[PDB]
Amino acid sequence: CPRFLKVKNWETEVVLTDTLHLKSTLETGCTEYICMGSIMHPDVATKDQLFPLAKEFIDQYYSSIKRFGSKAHMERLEEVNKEIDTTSTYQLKDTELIYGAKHAWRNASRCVGRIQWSKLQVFDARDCTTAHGMFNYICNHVKYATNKGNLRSAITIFPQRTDGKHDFRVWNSQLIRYAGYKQPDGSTLGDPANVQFTEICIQQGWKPPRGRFDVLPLLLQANGNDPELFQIPPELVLEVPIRHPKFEWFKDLGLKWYGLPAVSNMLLEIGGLEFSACPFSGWYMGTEIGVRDYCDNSRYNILEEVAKKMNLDMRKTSSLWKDQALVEINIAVLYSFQSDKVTIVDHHSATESFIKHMENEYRCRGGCPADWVWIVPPMSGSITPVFHQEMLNYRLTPSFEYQPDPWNTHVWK
Amino acid sequence: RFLKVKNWETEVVLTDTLHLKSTLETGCTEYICMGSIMHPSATKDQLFPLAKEFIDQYYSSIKRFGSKAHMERLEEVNKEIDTTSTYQLKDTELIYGAKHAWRNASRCVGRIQWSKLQVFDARDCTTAHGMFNYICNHVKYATNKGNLRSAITIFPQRTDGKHDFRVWNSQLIRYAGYKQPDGSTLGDPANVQFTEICIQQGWKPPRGRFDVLPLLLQANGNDPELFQIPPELVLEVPIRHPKFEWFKDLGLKWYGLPAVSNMLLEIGGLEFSACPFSGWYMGTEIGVRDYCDNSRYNILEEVAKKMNLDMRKTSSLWKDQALVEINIAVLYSFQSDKVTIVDHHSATESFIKHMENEYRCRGGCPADWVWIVPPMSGSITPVFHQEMLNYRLTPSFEYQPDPWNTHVW
Numbered sequence: 046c047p048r049f050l051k052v053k054n055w056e057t058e059v060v061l062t063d064t065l066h067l068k069s070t071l072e073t074g075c076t077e078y079i080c081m082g083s084i085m086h087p088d089v090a091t092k093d094q095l096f097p098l099a100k101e102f103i104d105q106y107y108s109s110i111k112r113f114g115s116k117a118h119m120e121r122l123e124e125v126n127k128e129i130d131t132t133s134t135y136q137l138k139d140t141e142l143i144y145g146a147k148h149a150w151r152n153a154s155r156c157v158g159r160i161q162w163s164k165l166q167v168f169d170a171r172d173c174t175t176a177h178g179m180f181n182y183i184c185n186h187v188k189y190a191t192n193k194g195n196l197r198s199a200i201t202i203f204p205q206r207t208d209g210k211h212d213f214r215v216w217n218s219q220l221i222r223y224a225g226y227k228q229p230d231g232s233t234l235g236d237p238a239n240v241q242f243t244e245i246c247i248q249q250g251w252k253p254p255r256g257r258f259d260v261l262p263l264l265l266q267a268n269g270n271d272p273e274l275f276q277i278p279p280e281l282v283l284e285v286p287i288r289h290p291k292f293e294w295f296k297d298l299g300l301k302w303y304g305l306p307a308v309s310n311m312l313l314e315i316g317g318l319e320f321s322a323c324p325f326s327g328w329y330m331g332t333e334i335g336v337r338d339y340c341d342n343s344r345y346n347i348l349e350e351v352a353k354k355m356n357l358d359m360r361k362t363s364s365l366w367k368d369q370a371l372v373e374i375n376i377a378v379l380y381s382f383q384s385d386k387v388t389i390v391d392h393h394s395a396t397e398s399f400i401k402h403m404e405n406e407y408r409c410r411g412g413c414p415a416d417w418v419w420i421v422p423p424m425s426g427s428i429t430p431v432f433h434q435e436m437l438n439y440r441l442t443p444s445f446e447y448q449p450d451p452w453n454t455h456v457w458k
Numbered sequence: 459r460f461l462k463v464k465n466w467e468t469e470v471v472l473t474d475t476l477h478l479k480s481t482l483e484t485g486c487t488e489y490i491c492m493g494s495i496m497h498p499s500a501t502k503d504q505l506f507p508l509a510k511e512f513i514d515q516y517y518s519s520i521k522r523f524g525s526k527a528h529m530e531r532l533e534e535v536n537k538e539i540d541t542t543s544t545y546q547l548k549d550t551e552l553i554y555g556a557k558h559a560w561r562n563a564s565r566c567v568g569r570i571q572w573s574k575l576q577v578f579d580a581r582d583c584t585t586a587h588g589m590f591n592y593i594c595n596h597v598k599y600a601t602n603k604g605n606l607r608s609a610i611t612i613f614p615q616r617t618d619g620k621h622d623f624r625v626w627n628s629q630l631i632r633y634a635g636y637k638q639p640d641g642s643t644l645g646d647p648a649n650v651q652f653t654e655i656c657i658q659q660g661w662k663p664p665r666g667r668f669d670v671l672p673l674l675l676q677a678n679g680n681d682p683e684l685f686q687i688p689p690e691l692v693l694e695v696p697i698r699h700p701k702f703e704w705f706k707d708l709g710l711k712w713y714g715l716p717a718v719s720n721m722l723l724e725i726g727g728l729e730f731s732a733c734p735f736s737g738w739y740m741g742t743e744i745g746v747r748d749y750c751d752n753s754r755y756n757i758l759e760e761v762a763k764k765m766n767l768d769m770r771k772t773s774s775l776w777k778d779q780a781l782v783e784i785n786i787a788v789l790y791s792f793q794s795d796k797v798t799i800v801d802h803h804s805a806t807e808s809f810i811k812h813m814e815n816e817y818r819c820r821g822g823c824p825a826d827w828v829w830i831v832p833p834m835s836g837s838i839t840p841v842f843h844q845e846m847l848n849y850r851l852t853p854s855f856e857y858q859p860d861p862w863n864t865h866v867w
């Protein structure tokens with residue numbers, strides 16, 4: 046591979062120079078002959094696989110603290126090496142765990158919020174032994190992160206994978222999501238995307254309220270056991286009702302959303318160690334809710350209903366009636382979050398901050414991996430700065446990876 | 459391997475086999491993806507196997523692979539390369555090659571139309587005056603009084619790189635750009651340099667906002683010469699709004715014929731360095747990019763003003779509101795003037811149907827998601843949710859160096 050790669054901004058003419066890509070550790074899925082850049086998703090490590098991966102991470106940590114080649118550095122290496130040899134695995138120090146989480150976020154190419162990468166409260170839940178404990182740790186996460194509306198980003202890390210038969214898993218893909226109920230007539234109530242999972246909860250014993258916005262319970266798996274259900278205390282789930290600063294009729298749509306965006310289905314990889322349950326959260330960019338959750342056809346799909354109340358011409362598509370209702374819905378989303386003092390950021394602010402982050406990363410780190418397809422907002426794309434920014438995508442470690450859904454793999458005891 | 463692509467909205471899965479036929483790099487490796495890089499990085503012995511491959515897929519596509527017709531054509535291309543270091547395409551081959559280069563154009567959302575393309579063979583052109591005549595005919599045919607028609611004019615292939623035919627204009631029709639004394643820019647800022655090359659060549663600029671640039675035509679590696687297209691061939695649209703009567707007072711117009719002239723058409727290892735091609739506009743090209751790009755006409759703030767919007771915080775989404783209205787006006791103007799235009803909803807729908815067509819009859823369709831998704835309202839068009847595989851099939855339209863960075867005067 047070439048040593049220096051250039052990326053250009055076509056709006057501002059700025060050329061940046063990337064050396065970081067040389068440290069690339071995982072495969073992107075692309076080859077010289079084909080590009081999988083728009084593809085969403087393109088029994089444990091042996092002692093001989095683990096040695097190099099650990100050292101790689103440890104060297105990197107001691108590099109970051111300006112102690113590379115130090116006595117403490119070599120002692121730590123020997124300690125890890127002996128531990129992998131005696132026990133087939135090793136344990137991270139707390140300092141190492143905190144560094145790893147922050148760097149997994151820093152490396153997350155699909156994330157536009159990374160200017161905040163170094164400000165992450167890390168909760169070490171590695172002493173957790175049961176689902177009830179997982180629940181306690183998660184409720185504490187939610188309340189801390191929620192902070193009465195002034196959200197703070199956090200990750201809670203449960204015990205690492207051992208033999209693969211003893212995984213900790215949060216079965217929910219996000220900590221806070223709404224239920225979805227298929228009707229006999231074929232229509233859906235709630236969030237249609239969550240029907241499969243809503244059905245799983247009901248099977249496990251959940252009593253469904255069968256409403257439009259029912260917060261799903263947590264389905265929690267400790268130490269490879271069958272998962273158990275818990276209801277998050279309602280008072281811990283901050284919610285915002287959606288209203289419009291001009292249209293008085295918008296509140297009559299009976300829409301609201303949850304304040305805390307928290308991903309619980311991904312795998313944290315640090316020094317070759319696998320943290321299969323590592324829920325993390327930050328704060329929302331408006332378009333996530335206003336464009337995707339609300340306007341995707343497979344989601345709440347409210348464009349039609351909103352276009353009507355707006356008295357828009359809906360016969361030809363070239364009136365752009367769809368577009369005009371999209372903007373208003375996203376105005377209402379940002380307006381309702383700011384008025385209730387819940388932290389939210391619009392797609393203009395967020396993309397602008399990300400350009401500045403990316404540049405500083407090029408200046409200090411020699412690169413900043415980014416997935417344009419995820420980075421560009423799902424509306425008004427070219428009037429945000431990221432649209433015009435060339436990006437290099439590649440996969441540094443530590444990282445957040447995808448993993449199989451647990452209901453596909455769980456062995457019911 | 460047989461690769462699969464999923465649409466996440468409809469859950470339709472398609473299976474791509476066609477990708478196995480490609481041999482040109484895309485720029486990515488297993489460890490670095492350059493999916494958002496705009497521009498990622500011949501003799502007898504080089505020229506033949508390519509000639510062969512192209513002749514082979516031609517006779518395969520007309521259902522006579524290994525025919526007597528096929529065999530002689532191969533021997534034909536043999537001797538011709540052996541003795542002239544090149545070869546000339548049959549007419550039928552030229553037409554097939556052009557249509558398929560459009561078909562293989564990953565970045566093009568309009569490809570449902572690929573097989574309806576009027577091919578003007580201009581290979582007997584020898585002078586810039588010649589080229590100009592050919593181009594005027596192209597523009598006039600393709601404009602067609604508003605009922606636009608896809609066309610391509612193909613000039614003589616490269617021979618030795620020293621006698622290249624080149625259209626210096628990157629597009630056949632574009633407005634001028636003037637670097638003002640006070641530091642502002644008049645017209646289209648994208649064109650400031652090219653405009654200045656024209657003025658330096660004798661062009662008398664009217665210094666207006668929307669001045670059609672003259673043609674700068676290079677024939678056979680010679681110095682280029684200026685030609686103004688006759689105004690009655692250049693169809694333009696005044697932009698007005700269906701509800702906002704003040705929008706006409708903005709003073710905006712755009713040309714009707716989108717016609718890319720800076721690209722290289724490659725067929726059978728032959729290089730057509732001058733091959734302007736045109737179709738018809740998708741509304742967002744003008745409403746979003748041309749008008750609202752910060753480094754282009756940059757009209758967002760002005761429009762938002764006339765809309766009396768609150769422009770103090772970005773979170774009022776005032777920019778978004780203005781953008782939607784600008785694109786409504788654009789569609790409405792063209793439509794009202796019986797000039798062919800397509801909205802990003804219609805065009806994306808057509809592209810998804812086209813994709814399904816391709817996978818069913820051809821086994822795939824290379825598509826560049828970064829280019830296919832419109833620059834506004836992305837996820838409320840179907841292509842946002844469509845996984846697409848990108849790879850490079852030939853015949854293709856490629857990029858080439860700007861001529862002013864290579865030509866020896």
Ligand code: HEM
Nearest residue numbers: 150153155156157158161198199325326327328329330445
């Ligand atoms: C602090 C405020 C943050 C903001 C505003 C933000 C912004 C975003 C946005 C808009 C997305 C796209 C999500 C989607 O389309 O589904 C995203 C994805 C993502 N974020 Fe961030 N983010 C934040 C914090 C974090 C944190 C704390 C982490 C991890 C420690 C993180 C890691 C990721 C990852 C891994 C993805 C892609 C997830 C996937 O594949 O579904 N982000 N972020």
Ligand code: HEM
Nearest residue numbers: 560563565566567568571608610735736737738739740855
């Ligand atoms: C017939 C109606 C057509 C429509 C609606 C259409 C639509 C589009 C659009 C919106 C773009 C993006 C251009 C940009 O943003 O700069 C594009 C690009 C492109 N089109 Fe099409 N197009 C059409 C016809 C054609 C024809 C006739 C050809 C060739 C014979 C062609 C080949 C290409 C190529 C090579 C690109 C990429 C240009 C570049 O790399 O800058 N298209 N098309």
Ligand SMILES: CNCCCc1cncc(CCc2cc(C)cc(N)n2)c1
Nearest residue numbers: 219306307308325326327328329330333
């Ligand atoms: C995988 N596609 C489905 C996404 C559904 C979904 C539903 N609720 C919340 C999120 C959160 C995504 C998300 C995560 C984080 C950490 C920050 C942020 N701004 N956004 C995602």
Ligand SMILES: CNCCCc1cncc(CCc2cc(C)cc(N)n2)c1
Nearest residue numbers: 629632716717718735736737738739740
């Ligand atoms: C390279 N990025 C800037 C392009 C600017 C530019 C200015 N005028 C016309 C075009 C042509 C774009 C274009 C080309 C074709 C063939 C069809 C279509 N609908 N649109 C492009």
Ligand SMILES: C[C@H](O)[C@H](O)[C@H]1CNc2nc(N)[nH]c(=O)c2N1
Nearest residue numbers: 083084085418419842843844845
């Ligand atoms: C097919 C395509 O990869 C898919 O729709 C992607 C496009 N870009 C995205 N970008 C973000 N932020 N989130 C998404 O879910 C997607 N989906």
Ligand SMILES: C[C@H](O)[C@H](O)[C@H]1CNc2nc(N)[nH]c(=O)c2N1
Nearest residue numbers: 432433434435494495496828829
């Ligand atoms: C950086 C990125 O490649 C560049 O901004 C691209 C993005 N997508 C595009 N898509 C289209 N249709 N036209 C363009 O000029 C661009 N520009």
Ligand SMILES: [Zn+2]
Nearest residue numbers: 075080486491
């Ligand atoms: Zn790629």
